[PDB]
Amino acid sequence: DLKSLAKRIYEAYLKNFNMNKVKARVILSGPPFVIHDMETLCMAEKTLVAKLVNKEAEVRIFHCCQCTSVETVTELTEFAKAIPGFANLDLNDQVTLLKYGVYEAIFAMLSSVMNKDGMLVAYGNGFITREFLKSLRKPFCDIMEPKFDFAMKFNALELDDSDISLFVAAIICCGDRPGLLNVGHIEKMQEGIVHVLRLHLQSNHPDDIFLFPKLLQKMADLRQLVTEHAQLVQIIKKTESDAALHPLLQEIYRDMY
């Protein structure tokens, strides 16, 4: 019953996200083209985003990041639509939950394609190194390093996709978002998902008896990561003309934090 809510959420995760942790680990275990310097970035661009190539490399990369985000937002909207109870909410609350939750979910899921040396990109066909991203000019070199720091500690929890699907549902189904209309119903929806997450972790991770409170803390850490990311994005938009922001992403950030 609750086991079935957990399975339905996991099934919806496997169906709606192009990348999952099993798929990513297969690729990361050895084929992705390695982007480790300007030469290989330019090569990967010609093979994997050929239409895109011509501002500075950093602005081209930032454009690619946005395309990745827009795609993941669409996947999250479908996944959410598949979360039992979500589609019965007021359409305006559905928008609010997704507006505040998508980047928390994005950076949680990004951990699955990250290791200490770099991350998968372009639908698993590239691997960009962490040191290359640090090498970009300011402010672009400041984007990803806090996400790697989050991911190394998140990955140390050794969650699998059955855990992560419930965690992403719990992020989305969050009753304390600003502007909610039916807070009471959302809190009950959230309580039900968190209940299923709590029991699932007890079953799937009997070795780690604090895993549930650890994940509650990661949820709070993600909120802060998102606030800080949104601040950097605002600095980039105001100080870099070549770095326009996609309209869906402007809509999400607008009046967020």
Binding site: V73, T74, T77, Q94, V95, K99, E251, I252
Partner: peptide
Amino acid sequence: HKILHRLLQ
């Protein structure tokens, strides 16, 4: 939020 609202429709 017209894109989200349409994405959800």
